[PDB]
Design a protein around this ligand. Structure first.
Ligand SMILES: *[C@@H]1O[C@H](CO)[C@@H](O)[C@H](O)[C@H]1NC(C)=O
Ligand SMILES: *[C@@H]1O[C@H](CO)[C@@H](O)[C@H](O)[C@H]1NC(C)=O
Ligand SMILES: *[C@@H]1O[C@H](CO)[C@@H](O)[C@H](O)[C@H]1NC(C)=O
Ligand SMILES: *[C@@H]1O[C@H](CO)[C@@H](O)[C@H](O)[C@H]1NC(C)=O
Ligand SMILES: *[C@@H]1O[C@H](CO)[C@@H](O)[C@H](O)[C@H]1NC(C)=O
Ligand SMILES: *[C@@H]1O[C@H](CO)[C@@H](O)[C@H](O)[C@H]1NC(C)=O
Ligand SMILES: *[C@@H]1O[C@H](CO)[C@@H](O)[C@H](O)[C@H]1NC(C)=O
Ligand SMILES: *[C@@H]1O[C@H](CO)[C@@H](O)[C@H](O)[C@H]1NC(C)=O
Ligand SMILES: *[C@@H]1O[C@H](CO)[C@@H](O)[C@H](O)[C@H]1NC(C)=O
Ligand SMILES: *[C@@H]1O[C@H](CO)[C@@H](O)[C@H](O)[C@H]1NC(C)=O
Ligand SMILES: *[C@@H]1O[C@H](CO)[C@@H](O)[C@H](O)[C@H]1NC(C)=O
Ligand SMILES: *[C@@H]1O[C@H](CO)[C@@H](O)[C@H](O)[C@H]1NC(C)=O
Ligand SMILES: *[C@@H]1O[C@H](CO)[C@@H](O)[C@H](O)[C@H]1NC(C)=O
Ligand SMILES: *[C@@H]1O[C@H](CO)[C@@H](O)[C@H](O)[C@H]1NC(C)=O
Ligand SMILES: *[C@@H]1O[C@H](CO)[C@@H](O)[C@H](O)[C@H]1NC(C)=O
Lengths: 458, 465
């Protein structure tokens, strides 16, 4: 299958494709994004092997294991660290220990990356994570071997704040989720917004509510109260920090309740969410903006995708992604390029470690701590972007504020601004189609002597 | 002293131990902690005393010996991961296999008496849950460890932070304080406490005027936002150092007296109680755990330290190299520690679960193949185990249940002391006629908002009519 290719140097891969008995990941609903990213990693490895300039004569293999969002993030790691006989020795020094994989392209959610890195830190095995944006992953003493090809929530919050300042909104509502992601994102946004003269009218927590399930009446009353507080408030810009799964029920009340006239700002969880934009009924709720990664077109990847031990197989992924092929094709490559550049950074680090140039390499034995040492210093041009790591293990890939325009014949998420993490400044802002009567920029102020705690209000 | 040599003894079923025995990279080398920690050694000795006195018992685990493997885990998780990986290795072998699930493993320890730290408990419990190894922890209190989705085999003999935060919310609701400010330490403990208290207050009709995080040693901004609201009651769910920093700043700033609701971290710590000038910063009310203590533990430590010096005993008889070069003075400071009962109760809970699993009886116990660690989990939930004559039970969430005592700082000659002014057992009961307040006279401070008649609050609950 596609979850394994023999090679000289193996490369672990963890992709989110979905007490006595343990429910396997294959029984959960198939997530298309994970399969797309897995195919991106495989295409990157195949293109590296195709090319005779980078790692010449060296085969780059991989071992891709289906990981879950939370459920299974242990065995995959134990399997990567073990030898070919599925046996991992216990010893104080691992400087001369050779694992099955030399690096892993780690999972996509923050908790899974933390769990994998807490066990990969004992071996200093490199781990480049895509699509994980926790500010806590920037701690290089807690996670010595953890790297990243995406900006953290630092730059996402910065992009949100600059978008607020450009259009002169100093009166915003923050809606977070009950999980640690929403709480951390809301706290970071609040602490940043408190020093740029933008006040938060209030903050509320949405209940944890996975879709396709029967929800209780207490959650319904909580949603009623939250939407009533939104409607009563004079702030007309709402920032939502919640997973892409838990917002279906909440937007239905905003609509059932018929609350109109707000600018919604979306975190990267649900900004480019294709199934959530599939709803096609939120159009009357105002304008939808979202922070995500800039599209980087990978030449030959769309055609490659269209042409195509345990927790290592899925069957409904192809039939699920067939129906999403055209919208994924039009939306471009956002996290795909993150996986691509992670694989290419690992390959360039391996090339530098082996010390070969346009000829057969030395084929020496490689310890993962050596590759981790060499991979911090990679600096190469990939698809007209400079790929190098910050002293905190981050790649400054441009972000993008994207606007939800309902049109299947065009890009479903039209780019309207570009964020540059290196200068922390948002520029190249384009026309935005506003929900107002005459396409005038919506106003979010509490005040045309101070009143209340907020400085913005008088 | 041949003390570290006694961190291991063989038995029919060997227990595991993760204690903070010591305190504090380019190569993958496990760091070594040379500094000595007295609490870790005291808790290890508490576990040792529990195991030995269980072995002495006839009606509990009859005809079988109980061992242990006490392992030094510093506050770092990278040093604690190695003992766990050794715990899950096959007995007599130095390798851990990569099987597809727990049923194929044969761990060398029946259970693990987990780490004291809550973050370390999170890491090791996430690791152990794959193998379904029962791990009961002492002193790990943060609530998210109670999720059976991600911790199917994590137990604890200390109450979670949810119990004390529910008690605090009940105290606020009973006293009429529905307009309060909630603060928490910037670490994970304070953030989780704040997140739990938000939901508790929203359910109980309390609205939070301000919800800030106090940094560990900014604070001026946090105290300014607290003062901006007309809040008379502040809930400070912070650690000892963050609370001490906030209180030092507010003492230096001559901040007005307030009712402080105290977490168990700083309610009793003498670092903040003895801070000069604290008598002018309002009443401190907190909920302190109502638990038993090991009456014969200090005697056990002193006799064991005395007996460890005999060359004959050691000759008849490393994990903690710094544990050998110590004296009784280095450990007698923390002899009367509450967590010793938690360690002792965790060991007794594992012993009772094992005794139930083997279906042993008083006269003897049936002979069968050794049980895997996952066989304990069925008998660890819904389990009643008696510790020191007082019954204890494990919840469906692996949480133990104990009452709480509402305490206040009464000042007499610059010497604050705790007094009983309430009791929480799932429902709060207080005696407010014996609570001495900080106000001009003995009137309860008023911290109220109107829910019905301008919206106000962090969650937009109250109105300024
Ligand atoms: C554990 O994995 C084995 C692999 O042979 C499988 O047969 C068994 O059903 C699994 N047990 C579970 C999922 O409880
Ligand atoms: C190069 O990669 C492509 C995928 O784009 C693959 O089909 C092909 O076999 C590889 N090799 C050559 C020689 O084209
Ligand atoms: C509950 O679940 C059933 C089965 O999916 C569904 O038909 C129904 O609409 C749900 N709600 C109620 C209120 O029964
Ligand atoms: C909008 O939603 C409200 C609240 O349910 C409903 O009463 C009303 O009929 C809906 N439609 C319009 C046009 O207001
Ligand atoms: C998107 O929504 C439409 C309209 O409800 C629906 O028919 C379709 O199945 C959805 N999904 C797609 C196009 O993948
Ligand atoms: C995908 O659906 C088609 C029908 O549209 C069916 O023939 C095919 O077997 C399905 N593939 C699967 C379930 O893998
Ligand atoms: C990477 O290389 C580019 C192009 O030579 C250079 O301008 C840049 O300074 C390098 N970056 C670092 C971090 O060394
Ligand atoms: C909208 O703008 C047009 C074009 O300037 C103008 O004629 C019209 O009066 C405006 N309408 C309103 C309601 O402001
Ligand atoms: C166990 O009993 C022995 C005598 O058999 C006694 O010397 C020892 O102190 C006891 N140990 C305990 C209670 O820990
Ligand atoms: C705090 O609030 C009080 C009451 O409004 C006010 O007198 C005082 O100046 C404020 N600031 C400080 C630092 O106490
Ligand atoms: C208390 O705060 C003051 C004012 O910032 C500072 O000078 C002093 O050092 C602090 N005290 C302690 C013990 O840290
Ligand atoms: C025992 O106490 C002495 C005296 O304070 C101290 O110097 C020594 O380091 C202690 N031993 C330890 C901490 O192992
Ligand atoms: C208790 O266990 C022993 C040893 O297995 C067994 O012989 C005996 O029948 C059991 N019951 C009683 C009542 O002693
Ligand atoms: C298990 O819990 C139930 C429900 O609280 C209780 O009735 C039962 O006695 C418990 N079983 C024990 C303690 O063995
Ligand atoms: C809890 O305490 C109350 C009095 O405050 C008492 O009536 C009740 O029986 C107690 N409940 C339990 C379970 O002990």
């Amino acid at each position: 299958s596609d979850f394994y290719l023999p090679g000289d140097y193996l490369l672990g891969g963890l992709f989110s494709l979905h007490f006595l008995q343990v429910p396997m990941c294959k029984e959960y609903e198939v997530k298309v994004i994970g399969y797309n990213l897995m195919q991106a990693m495989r295409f990157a490895v195949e293109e590296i092997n195709n090319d005779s300039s980078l790692l010449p004569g060296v085969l780059l293999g991989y071992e891709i294991v289906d990981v879950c969002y939370i459920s299974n993030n242990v065995q995959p790691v134990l399997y990567f660290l073990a030898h070919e006989d599925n046996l991992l020795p216990i010893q104080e020094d691992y400087s001369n220990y050779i694992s099955r994989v030399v690096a892993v392209i780690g999972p996509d959610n923050s908790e899974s990356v933390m769990t994998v890195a807490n066990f990969l830190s004992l071996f200093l095995l490199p781990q480049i994570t895509y699509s994980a944006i926790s500010d806590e992953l920037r701690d290089k003493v807690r996670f010595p071997a953890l790297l990243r090809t995406t900006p953290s929530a630092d730059h996402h919050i910065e992009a949100m704040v600059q978008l607020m300042l450009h259009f002169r909104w100093n009166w915003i509502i923050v809606l977070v989720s009950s999980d640690t992601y929403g709480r951390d994102n809301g706290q970071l946004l609040g602490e940043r917004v408190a020093r740029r003269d933008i006040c938060i009218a209030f903050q509320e927590t949405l209940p944890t509510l996975q879709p396709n399930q029967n929800m209780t009446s207490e959650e319904r009353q909580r949603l009623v109260t939250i939407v009533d507080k939104l409607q009563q408030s004079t702030a007309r810009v709402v920032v939502v920090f919640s997973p892409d799964l838990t917002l279906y029920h909440f937007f239905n009340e905003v609509l059932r309740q018929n609350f109109t006239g707000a600018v919604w700002i979306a975190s990267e969880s649900w900004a480019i969410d294709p199934v959530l934009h599939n709803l096609t009924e939120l159009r009357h709720l105002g304008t939808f903006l979202g922070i995500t990664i800039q599209s980087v077109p990978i030449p030959g990847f769309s055609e490659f995708r269209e042409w195509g031990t345990c927790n290592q197989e899925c069957d409904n992924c192809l039939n699920a992604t067939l129906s999403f092929n055209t919208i994924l094709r039009l939306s471009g490559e956002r996290v795909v390029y993150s996986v691509y550049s992670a694989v290419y950074a690992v390959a360039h680090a391996l090339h530098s470690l082996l010390g070969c140039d346009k000829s057969t390499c030395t084929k020496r034995v490689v310890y993962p701590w050596q590759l981790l040492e060499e991979i911090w210093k990679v600096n190469f041009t990939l698809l007209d972007h400079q790929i190098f790591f910050d002293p905190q293990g981050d790649v400054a890939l441009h972000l993008e504020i994207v606007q939800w325009q309902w049109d299947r014949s065009q890009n479903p998420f039209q780019s309207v601004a570009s964020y540059y993490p290196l200068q922390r400044q948002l520029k190249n802002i384009q026309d935005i189609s506003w929900h107002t009567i005459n396409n005038t920029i919506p106003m979010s102020m509490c005040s045309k002597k101070p009143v209340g705690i907020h400085v913005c209000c008088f | 002293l041949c003390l570290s040599q006694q961190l291991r003894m063989k038995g029919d079923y060997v227990l595991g131990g993760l204690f903070p025995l010591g305190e504090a990279r380019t190569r993958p080398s496990s760091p070594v902690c040379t500094r000595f920690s007295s609490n870790g050694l005291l808790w290890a000795l508490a576990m040792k005393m529990a195991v030995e006195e269980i072995n002495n018992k006839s009606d509990l685990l009859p005809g079988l010996r109980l061992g242990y493997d006490l392992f030094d885990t510093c506050s770092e998780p990278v040093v604690a991961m190695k003992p766990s990986l050794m715990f899950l290795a096959k007995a007599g072998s130095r390798d851990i296999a990569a099987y597809c699930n727990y049923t194929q493993y044969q761990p060398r320890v029946l259970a693990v008496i987990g780490p004291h730290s809550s973050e370390l408990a999170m890491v090791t419990g996430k690791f152990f849950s794959f193998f379904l190894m029962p791990q009961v922890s002492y002193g790990a209190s943060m609530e998210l460890l109670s999720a059976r989705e991600t911790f199917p085999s994590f137990f604890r003999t200390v109450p979670s932070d949810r119990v004390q935060l529910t008690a605090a919310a009940e105290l606020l609701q009973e006293f009429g304080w529905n307009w309060v400010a909630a603060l928490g330490s910037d670490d994970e403990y304070g953030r989780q406490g704040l997140s739990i208290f938000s939901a508790l207050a929203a359910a109980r009709g309390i609205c939070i005027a301000h919800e800030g995080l106090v940094p560990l040693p900014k604070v001026q901004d946090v105290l300014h936002q607290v003062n901006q609201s007309s809040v008379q009651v502040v809930l400070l769910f912070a650690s000892v150092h963050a609370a001490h920093a906030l209180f030092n700043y507010s003492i230096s700033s001559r901040l007005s007296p307030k009712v402080w609701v105290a977490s168990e971290a700083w309610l009793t710590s003498d670092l903040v109680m003895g801070l000069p000038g604290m008598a002018q910063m309002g009443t401190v009310l907190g909920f302190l755990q109502r638990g038993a203590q090991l009456h014969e533990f200090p005697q056990y430590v002193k006799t064991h330290l005395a007996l460890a010096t005999d060359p004959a005993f050691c000759s008849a008889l490393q994990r903690c190299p710094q544990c050998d070069c110590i004296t009784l003075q280095n450990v007698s400071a923390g002899l009367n520690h509450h967590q010793t009962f938690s360690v002792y109760a965790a060991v007794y809970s594992v012993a009772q679960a094992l005794h139930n699993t083997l279906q042993c009886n008083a006269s003897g116990c049936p002979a069968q193949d050794p049980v895997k660690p996952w066989q304990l989990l069925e008998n660890m939930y819904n389990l009643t185990f008696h510790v020191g004559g007082l019954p204890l039970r494990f919840d469906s969430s692996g949480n133990v249940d104990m009452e709480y005592d509402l305490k206040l700082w009464v000042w007499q000659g610059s010497v604050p002391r705790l007094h009983d002014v309430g009791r929480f057992n799932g429902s709060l009961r207080t005696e407010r006629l014996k609570i001495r307040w900080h106000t001009s006279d003995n009137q309860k401070p008023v911290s109220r908002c109107s829910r019905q008649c301008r919206v106000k609050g962090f969650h937009s609950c109250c109105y300024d009519c």
